[PDB]
Write an enzyme that holds these catalytic residues in place. Structure first.
Site, PDB file in Angstrom:
ATOM      1  N   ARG A   1      45.994  49.367  37.201  1.00 23.97           N
ATOM      2  CA  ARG A   1      44.802  48.950  37.922  1.00 23.97           C
ATOM      3  C   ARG A   1      44.701  49.622  39.283  1.00 23.97           C
ATOM      4  NH1 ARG A   1      43.182  42.637  38.637  1.00 23.97           N
ATOM      5  NH2 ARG A   1      44.990  42.596  40.047  1.00 23.97           N
TER       6      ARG A   1
ATOM      7  N   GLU B   1      34.021  40.687  37.119  1.00 19.09           N
ATOM      8  CA  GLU B   1      34.282  39.741  38.196  1.00 19.09           C
ATOM      9  C   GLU B   1      33.254  39.880  39.310  1.00 19.09           C
ATOM     10  OE1 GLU B   1      38.258  40.634  39.310  1.00 19.09           O
ATOM     11  OE2 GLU B   1      37.906  42.799  39.372  1.00 19.09           O
TER      12      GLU B   1
ATOM     13  N   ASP C   1      37.767  36.218  41.532  1.00 21.38           N
ATOM     14  CA  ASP C   1      36.911  37.102  42.319  1.00 21.38           C
ATOM     15  C   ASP C   1      35.449  36.874  41.969  1.00 21.38           C
ATOM     16  OD1 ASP C   1      38.458  39.240  44.052  1.00 21.38           O
ATOM     17  OD2 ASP C   1      39.609  39.051  42.190  1.00 21.38           O
TER      18      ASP C   1
ATOM     19  N   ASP D   1      47.035  35.336  45.288  1.00 23.48           N
ATOM     20  CA  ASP D   1      46.800  36.746  45.565  1.00 23.48           C
ATOM     21  C   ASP D   1      45.493  36.868  46.345  1.00 23.48           C
ATOM     22  OD1 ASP D   1      44.988  38.012  42.735  1.00 23.48           O
ATOM     23  OD2 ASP D   1      45.372  35.912  43.254  1.00 23.48           O
TER      24      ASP D   1
HETATM   25 MG   LIG Z   1      40.376  40.633  40.713  1.00 23.63          MG
END
Ligand SMILES: [Mg+2]
EC number: 2.3.3.9
Length: 720
Positions: A332, A427, A455, A626
């Site tokens: 990612r 997202e 998100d 996170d």
């Molecule tokens: Mg994300």
């Protein structure tokens, strides 16, 4: 320090890495490579910049739209026509089917758990890649799936009763997944291989499987195997056999362990779970990524941890075959927004970290496609494809731009077209409402879509920041927009023809210490049609595989096709508090919870450079924090503050009230500086305070700028 190539000034710590470690073996001329880099960064940067401005433009128009329409109940049709005319809402494209070829079977066919790991941590990355196979015994014993209530709890010494409960659980699982003709695995006394078929020795009778096709292989002698390999729903189940072992003598069949094929795919994250603000950090990440693709990546602990070699078994016939011992690896990259040093303009401005990630990660991934002495023994992709998931994309235009970028990078690396595949995250609200279009934009590179509800929640809050007071975050799960979001996601995926071609994935389980709860509830995702779902730990992957052994995902997808149980009006439904008023107790509960969640994560992000921490909430429940949850928590407070629910005095009092409590948690470390009682002079405290009190001004609510700024400021105020 600093090396000028073309119109770029490249940090030496990066130049050395790329030229001495990455490039050799890729058959790419370093001069040609760097020239292509300069050319790409030159050609795509202006087109890149336009997109980021379009985000601010669109968000501004909507922000003004809410201001001139206050108190009155929102007219949804006007909202729709507004988003239609401003370009936020795009026409639903003509029906189609993707043609993404050259993809491994772990994506197209196999349905199962998916890991997500910070690439900056060697240990966790190694465990993640090795999480392809995981012990069910260790997962059942170590976690709370088997209660420590009446019977036996845990301790220093091995517990007999708990062990037998684990064994019972595993036996029931075996009976439910790969059932015998008659009887149960719990009565088995041994295993033998007679005439290419599995024979289980019961005390009453002797039997084979209800359907011998589930017998995949074995190891050792045919009449006395050390392990028996079975298969269900594409997922392999391994029964280790050793009658004279630690757990064999206790078992009535000599079963030592039950290994499950857990993490089918693993995401090597360079985004929300890591903290990389400068060149050296990116160098560390690229280093670990290079070790992963080469296979020589190791990490010491009185011994050493390395990647699992491929497993080899004996076929039911008699020949030897080989199964993959490692998880298929995605990587990612970062979003389009943030920039980075490492390479800079001739002037002195940073370069989009996304482009850098594309080029560099793409370059490194070439090693994992081949098996040699230069590239390394361990091969990642058998089909010769690079799997890169691009997060935080706002719409078909940005998706298409990622496609163009990938094409240019493939041109630079000398890779054939569409070698670098894309995992389109879902997202973003604009991406959510233009999902079909986003898919059509990458209808030859897409390997998966995924519901990133965190998100998506944060973006949902920031997009309608001016619309009114949002509800408490713990209520967001009950809102129409998110359910419609999930359903529309799966529907779009299946309509696109992802069944057998691509993955439909779902969000992360954050309660890392609530594994019984995960076993109980997370089965909703594969029952919802999710080809895959994100898990926090290898153990959680092992436990999540059960759901896929119980649920036939393919059949669910077949029975889900065509249905459209999600209207666009439900997607645009803002999670407002409507006409609800919370008690001061509930208000301060939510505020203190949010503030603790913010502090506990930002203090470890800023000071120790950790991008993912196990932080408990206010109800003493360990969550996994996170950038996403931080974003939700920050935007929520930035909403309640911007709508008169709470004031700056409230949030400051709450932060100062929760700061010593967070200190209690991290009072066992060595490199942890207590941010108390001098709250005013702590960089972490200032980071949190700015994340809250200025979250309303952040581009799409993103937390990257502040975090990076404060992290750099921390590194500077400690270098001497
Ligand atoms: Mg994300």
């Amino acid at each position: 320090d600093r090396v000028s190539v073309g119109n770029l000034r490249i940090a030496r710590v990066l130049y050395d890495f790329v030229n001495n470690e990455a490039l050799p073996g890729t058959d790419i001329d370093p001069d040609s490579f760097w020239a292509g880099v300069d050319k790409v960064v030159a050609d795509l940067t202006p087109q890149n910049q336009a997109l980021l401005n379009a985000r601010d433009e669109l968000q501004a128009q909507i922000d003004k739209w809410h201001r001139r329409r206050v108190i009155e109940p929102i007219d949804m049709d006007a909202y729709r026509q507004f988003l239609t005319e401003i370009g936020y809402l795009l026409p639903e494209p003509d029906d189609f089917t993707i043609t993404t070829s050259g993809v491994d079977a772990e994506i197209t066919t196999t349905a199962g758990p998916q890991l997500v790991v910070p690439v900056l941590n060697a240990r966790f990355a190694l465990n993640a890649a090795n999480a392809r196979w995981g012990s069910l015994y260790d997962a059942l014993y170590g976690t709370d799936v088997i209660p420590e209530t009446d019977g036996a709890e845990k301790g220093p010494t091995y517990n007999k009763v708990r062990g037998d409960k684990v064994i019972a659980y595993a036996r029931k699982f075996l009976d439910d997944s790969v059932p015998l003709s008659s009887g149960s695995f719990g009565d088995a006394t041994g295993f033998t291989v007679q005439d290419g078929q599995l024979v289980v020795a019961l005390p009453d009778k002797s039997t084979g499987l209800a359907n011998p096709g589930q017998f995949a292989g074995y190891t050792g002698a045919a009449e006395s195997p050390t392990s028996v390999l079975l298969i269900n729903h594409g997922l392999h189940i391994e029964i280790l056999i050793d009658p004279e072992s630690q757990v064999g003598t206790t078992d009535r069949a000599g079963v030592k362990d039950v290994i499950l094929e857990s993490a089918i795919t693993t995401i090597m994250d360079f985004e929300d779970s890591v903290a990389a603000v400068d060149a050296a950090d990116k160098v560390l990440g690229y280093r670990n990524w290079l070790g992963l693709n080469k296979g020589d990546l190791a990490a010491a602990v009185a011994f050493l941890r390395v990647l699992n070699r491929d497993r080899n078994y004996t076929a039911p016939g008699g020949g030897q075959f080989t199964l993959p011992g490692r998880s298929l690896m995605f990587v990612r990259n970062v979003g389009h927004l943030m920039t980075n040093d490492a390479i800079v303009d001739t002037d002195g401005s940073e370069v989009f970290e996304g482009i850098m990630d594309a080029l560099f990660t793409g370059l490194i991934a070439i090693h994992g496609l081949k098996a040699s002495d230069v590239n390394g023994p361990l091969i990642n992709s058998r089909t010769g494809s690079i799997y890169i998931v691009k997060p935080k994309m706002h719409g078909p235009a940005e998706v298409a731009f990622t496609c163009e970028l990938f094409s240019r990078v493939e041109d630079v690396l000398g890779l054939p077209q569409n070698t670098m595949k894309i995992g389109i995250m879902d997202e973003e609200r604009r991406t959510t409402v233009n999902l079909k279009a986003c898919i059509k934009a990458a209808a030859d590179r897409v390997v998966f879509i995924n519901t990133g509800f965190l998100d998506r929640t944060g973006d949902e809050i920031h997009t309608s920041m001016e619309a009114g007071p949002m509800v408490r975050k713990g209520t967001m799960k009950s809102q129409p927009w998110i359910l419609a979001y999930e359903d529309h996601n799966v529907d779009a995926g299946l309509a696109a023809g992802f069944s057998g071609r691509a993955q439909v994935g779902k969000g992360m389980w954050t309660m890392t210490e609530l594994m019984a709860d995960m076993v109980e509830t997370k089965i909703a995702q594969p029952r919802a049609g999710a080809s895959t779902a994100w898990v926090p730990s290898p153990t959680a992957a092992t436990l999540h595989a059960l759901h896929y052994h119980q649920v036939d995902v393919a059949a669910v997808q077949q029975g889900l096709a065509g249905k459209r149980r999600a209207t666009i009006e439900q997607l645009l439904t803002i999670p407002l508090a409507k006409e609800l008023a919370w008690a001061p107790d509930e208000i301060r509960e939510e505020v203190d919870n949010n503030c603790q969640s913010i502090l506990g994560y930002v203090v470890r992000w800023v000071d120790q450079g950790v991008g993912c921490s196990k932080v408990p909430d206010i109800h003493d429940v360990a969550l996994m924090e996170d950038r996403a949850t931080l974003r939700i928590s920050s935007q929520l407070l930035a909403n309640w503050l911007r709508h008169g629910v709470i004031t700056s005095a409230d949030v400051r009092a709450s932060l100062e009230r929760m700061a010593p409590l967070v200190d209690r948690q991290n009072a066992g470390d060595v490199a942890y500086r207590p941010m108390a009682p001098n709250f005013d002079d702590s960089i972490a405290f200032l980071a949190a305070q700015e994340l809250i009190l200025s979250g309303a001004q952040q581009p799409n609510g993103y937390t990257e700028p502040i975090l990076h700024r404060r992290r750099r400021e921390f590194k500077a105020r400690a270098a001497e």
